[PDB]
Amino acid sequence: MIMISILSLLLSTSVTLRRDMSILFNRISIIALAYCILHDTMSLSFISKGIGLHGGLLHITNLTQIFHIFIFIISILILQLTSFYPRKVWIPEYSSLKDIFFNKILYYRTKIINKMGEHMKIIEYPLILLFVISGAVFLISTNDLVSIFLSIELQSYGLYLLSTIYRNSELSTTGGLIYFLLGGLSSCFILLGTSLLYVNSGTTSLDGLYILNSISDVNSWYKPYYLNFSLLIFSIGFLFKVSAAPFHFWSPDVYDAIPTIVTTFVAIIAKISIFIFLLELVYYTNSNANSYLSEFSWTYALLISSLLSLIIGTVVGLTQFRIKRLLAYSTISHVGFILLALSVSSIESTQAFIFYLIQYSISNLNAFFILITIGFSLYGYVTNNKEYKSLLDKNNSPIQLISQLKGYFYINPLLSLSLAITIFSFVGVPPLVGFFAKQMVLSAALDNGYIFLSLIAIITSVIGAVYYLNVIKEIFFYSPEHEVNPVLNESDSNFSLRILNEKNVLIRSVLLKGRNIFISSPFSITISIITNVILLFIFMNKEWLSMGTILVQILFSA
């Protein structure tokens, strides 16, 4: 279905040059991904460690199909950013169901809703978006060394294209160059690792590699050192793509330079596909008998990177003043927790891994959604701050500095509380979902004898909390630097709105002002659902946690 949509969208896109079609194409991509969820919901009625498909080059598991749906749902939520205008006009005289569904309203919308904004004029943006999704879901379902390489390039090349698709921004083309150049080096290490597996084992099949690993784990002439060493080189390339330390330098630069709406997709979708792919490869290569194999296990690169990410993510975030660089470093610290759970290969840690990945993706999505919504809300506000005037790409990244959030609690108190809840979920304060995620990882690491890493995880968490608190302090402890726009409410600056019936006949005529210009419903509702999932998780945890419990039992089923 994703492939039919890509081909069908491309054909419809090929024969048009109208940039006013961009919003419509984004909405059709939402509809198309909804069918993809339907076809994969249909496919979960079986219990198996895996079914190889299509000549054995692909495979399907219950885990694979669950995370296809999650990738689809995250992509639908993100696609809203380019499918609905950021602002709307609301009035009590056009709020009934008979109104929204039988009557129409008319006003000069173009300036109010930013009809011609850059993020509403890119025809091919939803199409490159679906290309990345195809690479991500193919990587999850990959069963072969060549399939691994093709899927990772497919996802990677699309992300480079998305970082540059805003071709008139000097920042975006610069960020696209950086990701491609360092990303291309990372892809050599993946190809080198895959090639070294093939030249030694004689197979591109992951099944066969697992069989070779399993027999060689006994307790002479062809001792299989290649498998751990190759997967070590192979894993390093995947650590770059999740921005794990010490391979993380690119992301604070790339995430800040590319537009925020692009950053939302680019910084979320890629970690889910790589981590899920790594999870299975960690399980089937994990030696049981303490032999010479286990001492050279490639998974120490994951444990070292988790350690290095816990320190770099929290320490370096202390001095960041630009909000997008802070989120990049906040992400690095969270992949430190994710990588600890992947490294401990226990039933408990795999449940913790599965839960942590989903809740962090939801939470990081909220932070970006709140940050974009605050940017779209400042339209009716002005400021005289000299720092804000000297910012580059203000239209692509309206909020660039933490100081821009100063006194946002006095501009929109409830939206500021949603930001605070999300950030407090990042620190791990109970009873927020973020706490329960960190709690499961720590309990699983503690139960497996990972005491030293568990202690560094708690210590770095206090350091990380400092810059989290620093964002909250700017929003709540100070009065804002933004003033409401005088000419929007000046007792005579009122624009007109017509309310018309099914037959385009006038019903009423109302004069409106800037205080009638609100945030669009898609963004407020998405923030409201996710914020309440974060806050109220303790009453809704049974099904969500039981899903991962069952998934791990299938994976571990002796």
Ligand X SMILES: CCCCCCCCCCCCCCCCCC(=O)OC[C@H](COP(=O)([O-])OCC[N+](C)(C)C)OC(=O)CCCCCCCCCCCCCCCCC
Q: Site map for ligand CDL, 74-113, x if CB under 6 A?
A: ----------x---x-x---------x-------------
384 touches other proteins (CB under 8 A): yes
**Dihedral of the CA atoms 222, 225, 227, 230 (nearest 10)?**
-130
- Would you state the structure tokens that stand for residue 393, as one six-digit string? 């790409």
- Pick 312 or 358: Cβ nearer ligand X: 358
- Pick 47 or 199: Cβ nearer ligand LMN: 47
Q: How far is the CB of 342 from ligand X (least distance, A)?
A: 24
List 113, 162, 266, 457, residue binding other proteins (CB under 8 A): 113
Contact criterion met (CB below 8 Å) for 172 and 163: yes
- Would you state the structure tokens that stand for residue 219, as one six-digit string? 């307790």
Radius of gyration of the chain (CA): 25
| Residue 47 touches which of ligand LMN, ligand CDL, other proteins, none (Cβ within 5-8 Å per kind) | ligand LMN
32 touches ligand X (CB under 6 A): no
- Pick 36 or 328: Cβ nearer ligand X: 36
* Cβ count near 370 (within 10 Å): 25
List 485, 520, 528, 549, residue binding other proteins (CB under 8 A): 485
| Residue 502 touches which of ligand CDL, ligand LMN, other proteins, none (Cβ within 5-8 Å per kind) | none
389 touches other proteins (CB under 8 A): yes
Residues 6+ apart with CB under 8 A from 10: 127
Contact criterion met (CB below 8 Å) for 276 and 341: no
By three-state DSSP, how is residue 509 classified?
strand
Number of continuous H segments (helices) and E segments (strands) in the chain: 24, 9
- Would you state the structure tokens that stand for residue 52, as one six-digit string? 């190889």
Q: What sign for the dihedral angle of Cα 311, 272, 165, 186?
A: positive
| Residue 521 touches which of ligand CDL, ligand LMN, other proteins, none (Cβ within 5-8 Å per kind) | ligand CDL
Contact criterion met (CB below 8 Å) for 140 and 68: yes
Contact criterion met (CB below 8 Å) for 61 and 159: no
- Pick 8 or 291: Cβ nearer ligand CDL: 8
Q: Site map for ligand CDL, 261-300, x if CB under 6 A?
A: ----------------------------------------
Length of the chain: 558
Element (H, E) at 495: strand 495-500
From CA 23, how far away is CA 67, in angstroms rounded? 27
Contact criterion met (CB below 8 Å) for 79 and 370: no
370 touches other proteins (CB under 8 A): no
- Pick 100 or 455: Cβ nearer ligand CDL: 100
- Taking each helix axis from N to C end, the angle separating 269-284 and 347-377, rounded to the nearest 10 degrees, works out to 170
List 158, 375, 434, 548, residue binding other proteins (CB under 8 A): 375
76 touches ligand X (CB under 6 A): yes
Residue span binding ligand CDL (CB under 6 A) among the ranges 191-199, 349-357, 463-471, 515-523: 515-523
| Residue 211 touches which of ligand X, other proteins, ligand CDL, none (Cβ within 5-8 Å per kind) | none
536 touches ligand CDL (CB under 6 A): no
- Pick 28 or 311: Cβ nearer other proteins: 28
Which of 433, 420, 426 lies closest to 537 in space, CA to CA? 433
From CA 165, how far away is CA 146, in angstroms rounded? 28
- Pick 282 or 551: Cβ nearer ligand LMN: 551
Contact set with ligand LMN (CB under 6 A): 41-42, 44-45, 47, 62, 66, 69-70, 358, 533, 540, 543-544, 547, 550-551, 554
List 74, 78, 81, 112, residue binding other proteins (CB under 8 A): 112
Residues between 292 and 331 that touch other proteins (CB under 8 A): none
For residue 345, what is the DSSP state? -
51 touches other proteins (CB under 8 A): yes
From CA 31, how far away is CA 12, in angstroms rounded? 15
- Would you state the structure tokens that stand for residue 9, as one six-digit string? 């969208």
Residues between 55 and 74 that touch ligand X (CB under 6 A): 73
| Residue 12 touches which of ligand LMN, ligand X, ligand CDL, none (Cβ within 5-8 Å per kind) | ligand CDL
- Would you state the structure tokens that stand for residue 252, as one six-digit string? 């604070």
From CA 515, how far away is CA 172, in angstroms rounded? 34
Q: How far is the CB of 360 from ligand LMN (least distance, A)?
A: 12
Backbone angles phi, psi at 334, to 5 degrees: -75, -35
Q: How far is the CB of 150 from other proteins (least distance, A)?
A: 13
- Pick 15 or 289: Cβ nearer ligand CDL: 15
Report the half-sphere exposure of 318 (CA within 13 A, side-chain side): 11
459 touches ligand X (CB under 6 A): no
From CA 109, how far away is CA 89, in angstroms rounded? 9
382 touches ligand X (CB under 6 A): no
| Residue 31 touches which of other proteins, ligand CDL, ligand LMN, none (Cβ within 5-8 Å per kind) | other proteins
Residues 6+ apart with CB under 8 A from 17: 123
Q: How far is the CB of 444 from other proteins (least distance, A)?
A: 31
Q: How far is the CB of 38 from ligand LMN (least distance, A)?
A: 9
Which of 385, 272, 255 lies closest to 323 in space, CA to CA? 255
Residue span binding ligand X (CB under 6 A) among the ranges 32-40, 317-325, 409-417, 470-478: 32-40
Residues 6+ apart with CB under 8 A from 535: 421, 432
List 7, 318, 414, 540, residue binding other proteins (CB under 8 A): 7
The residues facing 511 across adjacent strands are: 496
* Interface residue list for ligand X (CB under 6 A): 34, 37-38, 41, 73, 76
* Interface residue list for ligand CDL (CB under 6 A): 4, 7-8, 11-12, 15, 84, 88, 90, 100, 520-522, 525-526, 529, 533
